[PDB]
Design a protein around this motif. Structure first.
Motif, PDB file in Angstrom:
ATOM      1  N   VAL A 115       0.802  -1.243   0.000  1.00  0.00           N
ATOM      2  CA  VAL A 115       0.000   0.000   0.000  1.00  0.00           C
ATOM      3  C   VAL A 115       0.829   1.286   0.000  1.00  0.00           C
ATOM      4  CG1 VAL A 115      -2.032  -1.109   1.018  1.00  0.00           C
ATOM      5  CG2 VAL A 115      -0.389   0.098   2.514  1.00  0.00           C
ATOM      6  N   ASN A 116       1.948   1.293   0.713  1.00  0.00           N
ATOM      7  CA  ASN A 116       2.748   2.509   0.746  1.00  0.00           C
ATOM      8  C   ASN A 116       3.584   2.680  -0.521  1.00  0.00           C
ATOM      9  OD1 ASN A 116       1.604   3.367   3.105  1.00  0.00           O
ATOM     10  ND2 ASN A 116       3.167   2.461   4.423  1.00  0.00           N
ATOM     11  N   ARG A 119       1.395   4.385  -2.883  1.00  0.00           N
ATOM     12  CA  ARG A 119       1.316   5.810  -2.564  1.00  0.00           C
ATOM     13  C   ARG A 119       2.561   6.588  -2.980  1.00  0.00           C
ATOM     14  NH1 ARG A 119      -1.290   3.619   2.624  1.00  0.00           N
ATOM     15  NH2 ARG A 119      -3.445   4.420   2.446  1.00  0.00           N
ATOM     16  N   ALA A 127       7.078   4.551   7.295  1.00  0.00           N
ATOM     17  CA  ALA A 127       5.768   4.751   7.922  1.00  0.00           C
ATOM     18  C   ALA A 127       5.991   5.044   9.398  1.00  0.00           C
ATOM     19  CB  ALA A 127       4.910   3.522   7.743  1.00  0.00           C
ATOM     20  N   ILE A 128       5.797   6.300   9.793  1.00  0.00           N
ATOM     21  CA  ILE A 128       6.134   6.723  11.152  1.00  0.00           C
ATOM     22  C   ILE A 128       4.931   7.326  11.883  1.00  0.00           C
ATOM     23  CG2 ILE A 128       8.591   7.080  10.687  1.00  0.00           C
ATOM     24  CD1 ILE A 128       7.889  10.152  10.455  1.00  0.00           C
ATOM     25  N   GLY A 187       0.259   5.260   6.987  1.00  0.00           N
ATOM     26  CA  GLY A 187       0.124   5.680   5.598  1.00  0.00           C
ATOM     27  C   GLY A 187      -1.127   6.511   5.362  1.00  0.00           C
ATOM     28  N   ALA A 190      -0.731  10.022   6.943  1.00  0.00           N
ATOM     29  CA  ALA A 190       0.050  10.870   6.054  1.00  0.00           C
ATOM     30  C   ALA A 190      -0.743  11.300   4.826  1.00  0.00           C
ATOM     31  CB  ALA A 190       1.362  10.179   5.650  1.00  0.00           C
ATOM     32  N   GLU A 191      -1.466  10.364   4.209  1.00  0.00           N
ATOM     33  CA  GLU A 191      -2.216  10.666   2.990  1.00  0.00           C
ATOM     34  C   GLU A 191      -3.348  11.658   3.249  1.00  0.00           C
ATOM     35  OE1 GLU A 191      -3.768   7.353   0.725  1.00  0.00           O
ATOM     36  OE2 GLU A 191      -4.997   8.624  -0.567  1.00  0.00           O
TER      37      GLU A 191
ATOM     38  N   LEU B 158      -6.718  -1.175  -1.267  1.00  0.00           N
ATOM     39  CA  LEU B 158      -7.231   0.132  -0.838  1.00  0.00           C
ATOM     40  C   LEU B 158      -8.597   0.434  -1.452  1.00  0.00           C
ATOM     41  CD1 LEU B 158      -3.922   2.250  -0.926  1.00  0.00           C
ATOM     42  CD2 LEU B 158      -5.107   1.326   1.112  1.00  0.00           C
ATOM     43  N   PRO B 162      -5.496   5.872  -4.010  1.00  0.00           N
ATOM     44  CA  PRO B 162      -4.920   7.147  -4.442  1.00  0.00           C
ATOM     45  C   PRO B 162      -4.710   7.139  -5.955  1.00  0.00           C
ATOM     46  CG  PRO B 162      -3.221   5.755  -3.473  1.00  0.00           C
ATOM     47  CD  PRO B 162      -4.533   5.035  -3.270  1.00  0.00           C
TER      48      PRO B 162
ATOM     49  N   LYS D 172       3.445  15.897  -0.787  1.00  0.00           N
ATOM     50  CA  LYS D 172       2.175  15.304  -0.393  1.00  0.00           C
ATOM     51  C   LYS D 172       2.292  14.556   0.932  1.00  0.00           C
ATOM     52  CE  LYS D 172      -1.884  13.555  -0.548  1.00  0.00           C
ATOM     53  NZ  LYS D 172      -3.071  14.397  -0.195  1.00  0.00           N
ATOM     54  N   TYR D 173       3.371  13.789   1.067  1.00  0.00           N
ATOM     55  CA  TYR D 173       3.574  12.955   2.252  1.00  0.00           C
ATOM     56  C   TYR D 173       4.364  13.626   3.371  1.00  0.00           C
ATOM     57  CZ  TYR D 173       0.705   9.440   0.362  1.00  0.00           C
ATOM     58  OH  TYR D 173      -0.406   8.774  -0.082  1.00  0.00           O
TER      59      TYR D 173
END
Ligand SMILES: Nc1ncnc2c([C@@H]3O[C@H](CO)[C@@H](O)[C@H]3O)n[nH]c12
Ligand SMILES: Nc1ncnc2c([C@@H]3O[C@H](CO)[C@@H](O)[C@H]3O)n[nH]c12
Ligand SMILES: Nc1ncnc2c([C@@H]3O[C@H](CO)[C@@H](O)[C@H]3O)n[nH]c12
Ligand SMILES: Nc1ncnc2c([C@@H]3O[C@H](CO)[C@@H](O)[C@H]3O)n[nH]c12
Ligand SMILES: Nc1ncnc2c([C@@H]3O[C@H](CO)[C@@H](O)[C@H]3O)n[nH]c12
Ligand SMILES: Nc1ncnc2c([C@@H]3O[C@H](CO)[C@@H](O)[C@H]3O)n[nH]c12
Lengths: 237, 237, 237, 237, 237, 237
Positions: A115-116, A119, A127-128, A187, A190-191, B158, B162, D172-173
């Protein structure tokens, strides 16, 4: 309302605690919140809103896996004014020195999900969690006299992984707990422009095969909930 | 019992119908099965066992997404002797000729998940249904006067993508419906040596609002369930 | 004419049978078709058009590998009005219960090629046959007293693979036969809106190595062609 | 000695500050350390050891890019007893609200390098700093009255990227700064069992094209150095 | 014999010329070789062995695409003692300064195939020709009054690519010709320790489309074969 | 001036030799060039311009790794009119027949970096040298009585690899030397329309300790430099 949540703007607090199990969300509402009211039951994914020490707080299940929790967290952020998500859950440990019922705070989350990459143009998105939220949880834990490790989680797509050797790689790289949601929630945050943190309780050991029962996970991870709730109060100040 | 199912061997039939929504599993048991008893409630993921025209049948929710349904399907197969899984769900359409309320049978399932690449040495695993189960479903639909469409589903990680550009790609390559589970279930079936099939009804068109009535949509949903149940009887012989 | 086929619209039937070995096209034309006429000779890839029980049918080799068969199948569909392609070939087996001379029908085709990832935004496209064509072949075989197995093929780019361990993975995931074309043909069929099926006879067992007679091989080849041709007639109804 | 550092165990402090530019390492030694002695000059990659407020501290350049800094950090960890690495550097901003000379602390580092995929079986490793080190830097900054943002960096392999659109994705992120080392240093720290943090000063804006000169970067990012040095003192307590 | 070549050790020269079109092998044998004998006919892929100015040379088609030519080149090297393979083919041009009938020598070959990633642990293998063979071809061309361009080819898996924009990328990076084999042949050569070269004549310009005579085409084809044959003699010294 | 080079147009020759170590650039200028002047010192990355046998020549360090050398080579080409880059470096051997002090010329460079995939739409770009430059180097070596080996280098991102298995893979596919820059330089040359070549001397065998003397190693290094310089004179005509 949204496709998976039958509620309206205002029904949720601006902070939502989220375990995977909706029955645990119910337990949290009954045990920790005052004047709790049920605000969603679409697909059995129970959500509640009440107060903790005067502070409006919501708690709702997110289901198992990145795709499930991505739906619920997105909808809360875009349509219900939710600013902070605190995942409160379970994980399996791979490190020898990590024990059952240890509390772990995921400042980062590794993953085998795509998924990331979808993105982030197929690059590595770290991913934090939100730093202030992490710090709040660490401080709340210290005040409660509860030990908590801070580091990386690993969010797996397959609970039953065909690649057992990957656990050696997780162990090598110091992964504190294996769960199935954190990297996806981070994620989404962030999005869609919100803040998130995952706190987990070690519910099983991937090496020793020691584990908690279903009933245990549902109604017996109280230190983690107190940490989460108290961390919100610190963030408010 | 397993970590996610509090039941014992024998509590499930050797065929399990699986909607995503546990409340829909209760709906199916109450509407179509005789002498149905609840056999699971862990995490609110309701499962039931009863009879359809004398034949033992189970129905249990699988939750949303590949990682959720992969847990439940694996456990049913390895620990409860389940031989066939029939997912009964909803999907979104991308093809203009595919209409609201069409019944779609997923002989194959495309996906943007990494789970099958993890299984299959990073090559392309064609996630497919069991042929005899597909044939049984097609025949049951014909007996009921319904012309199911048979082709590819796309199992998305998802729900809120996106990308967006991907829907045009799905349309170009003839994808009949977009859902979130089929490719994962088919991967589990292959990994653990069982058989699976996904049938969906078109609930929306990633496109306009074609407009139906609640009564008509609910009729078609029930037709899908009848197709699944009757297909089992055909497979028995 | 197209770059690889010196013919005009109408020269090919709407159904084309395709062996990999170009020498087989003339054999099929002379042995099974009435009134056959030559319709292509470019690069020695002889093509013929005739009738089988009154039904217009064409036959032409496709060459070895995904890139070769992708060229011919594309040109046939886009410039010659071809609606159905049936690949008739040989495959190697990895399952011990799959025997030399068994007929395998590829409802799906796994692959280690990149062609479908190029088409499908680097996601997993499930390369599948047309369902009715699959069922027609199964039914035609049954009428001829032949029990075909239906499942996944694996379409290899490297006949001589340096990854010997991949055969164990194929076996674990139930792959029925290893060949070099099906996933490519299925990808072209989806890209250009046509229908395809691959039928193979098991010519070797990858692990071991047993033997067979020239007479046994011709009998089995003829059986496959008879299945293919009769399957077309069933498809017409 | 190691292949790129001509020194012996004991020559370095257990904490090493590392800018990319060895001339900046020289400036830090001359400006902030007492009794500084040069301990390496192999390849011109100057390193020094001295004291800051009585505390033994080293500073040494790491060169530009993940491959360069991975060599130096590895060697320090495995052969020189180095426990903490604090990268002190420059980055380009993509966010409108991030200004020149802003200080950013990389709790995480995204990347387009393959190095962490090589380490982590081609999955997503979240390249993260040590939490205590992050917290120490935040506290030191607050005490010095210097603003600092905490979040993700992006470690690029190509300073001159052919993919300008990726900067929109970084923006964006919420990427705070684009540099070329953090994700690699964090990967080394995890692999070889040490602790690391990257602090950067915004030296240019990728959108506005505003930038500092070479001389500026070499000898004029003092607030960042004070933060780093004071953060060590906090960690010692 | 091998699965695709019905011949024995000694039947082939240590150098084999390979056109893609199998009909060209007999033409080359009759036009350029003395005392030619037929050495293969399997699948119509005619092979011949004869002499050119006293030097033993073989010629046999390779079929279209990486998987096809990979089979033949492997078998020739491992079972027939072949040391050098020279592919002689056609290519399409993307650079405007590269003209129809130009001779292009592929010192390297880019590709969108996965075959070399499969060989090379998913890293980038630079598929290259043997340097002396390249220089021999350049020198042989010069002696014939032909100026060959030396650079990268691009070996496509899809003659009909859905990614039209890739041709612009090829142009930007200086690709001289687009064909379908070189990278595969070079990969086989490296895998089995032999030497290879691809020489192509420009048959089309991808963007535009200009014209040429049959007589011009044969002249240019003969020129390429003459270059190939004379290059072998230079290699012998 | 550029961000990493404080010089103006004309300060560099149109050919630049580049070792990784800036101290080695000083070594080369002092040993081989007449009237050499320093033209860059930013980040300690020394560059010089002088004459060799009357011909203007520059030499400047590039630092370690693809990202470092990509910065310097890009800037030289786009801002300083540089037409040819010759990397002059060290490499490690994996082939048993490749010995300490052999001179290796990289006609191609394999890599585990992602930089060329980023450039080339995630396909395989064959990172190659300029043919005429390779030929000039081979000829210059012959004139000096040295037989350079021409083939593939491997440009590694990690000097300290966690893999290890990759060295056997390199050996299998005939890689002549392992270094850290060639593939990146060749990618830059292609992107910006210039010409490049990498020559290396074997400094170690990823394998034993073959044992030479300092005098012999230094002699061979100087031979490599003489080869590079003389090759330029041959290219001029
Ligand atoms: N050993 C383990 N592996 C993966 N996930 C989990 C969990 C969490 O519990 C659920 C699966 O039991 C899922 O939500 C996951 O995040 N507990 N123990 C786990
Ligand atoms: N347009 C759409 N996209 C993705 N999933 C779904 C579904 C199904 O419903 C669930 C998400 O609402 C999930 O289980 C999925 O399979 N219906 N319509 C859908
Ligand atoms: N064990 C095997 N592996 C790969 N391909 C084949 C075949 C088919 O035969 C050809 C290669 O001999 C090719 O067209 C492929 O589809 N038969 N047996 C095979
Ligand atoms: N806009 C930018 N992009 C990438 N890196 C950098 C840097 C840092 O400076 C060096 C390149 O100038 C390198 O070490 C990198 O980490 N400053 N500004 C940058
Ligand atoms: N524009 C083009 N694209 C791809 N291949 C080719 C060829 C060669 O011709 C065959 C396809 O026609 C194949 O063997 C390929 O190498 N000529 N022109 C081409
Ligand atoms: N065995 C080896 N592996 C990787 N790089 C190198 C080198 C070169 O030396 C530097 C690393 O020491 C770097 O620039 C690389 O190209 N020499 N020997 C090497």
């Amino acid at each position: 309302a949204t496709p998976h949540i039958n509620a309206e703007m205002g029904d949720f607090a601006d902070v939502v605690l989220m375990p995977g199990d909706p029955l645990r969300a119910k337990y949290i509402a009954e045990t920790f919140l005052e004047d709790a009211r049920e605000v969603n039951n679409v697909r059995g994914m129970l959500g509640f809103t009440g107060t903790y020490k005067g502070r409006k707080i919501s708690v709702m299940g997110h289901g198992m896996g990145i795709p499930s929790c991505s739906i619920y967290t997105k909808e809360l952020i875009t349509d219900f004014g939710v600013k902070k998500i605190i995942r409160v859950a379970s994980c399996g440990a791979v490190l020898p020195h990590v024990k059952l019922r240890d509390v772990v705070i995921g400042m980062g989350a590794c993953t085998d999900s795509k998924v990331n990459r979808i993105r982030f143009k197929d690059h590595d998105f770290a991913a934090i969690a939100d730093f202030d939220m992490v710090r709040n949880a660490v401080d709340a834990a210290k005040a409660l006299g509860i030990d908590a490790r801070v580091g990386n989680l690993f969010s797996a797509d397959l609970f039953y992984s065909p690649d057992g050797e990957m656990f050696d790689v997780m162990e090598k790289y110091g992964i504190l707990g294996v769960e199935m949601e954190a990297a996806g929630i981070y994620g989404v945050a962030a999005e869609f422009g919100a803040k998130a943190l995952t706190i987990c309780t070690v519910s099983d050991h991937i090496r020793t095969h020691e584990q908690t029962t279903a009933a245990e996970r549902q109604t017996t991870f109280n230190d983690m909930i107190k940490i989460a709730l108290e961390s919100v109060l610190l963030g408010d100040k």
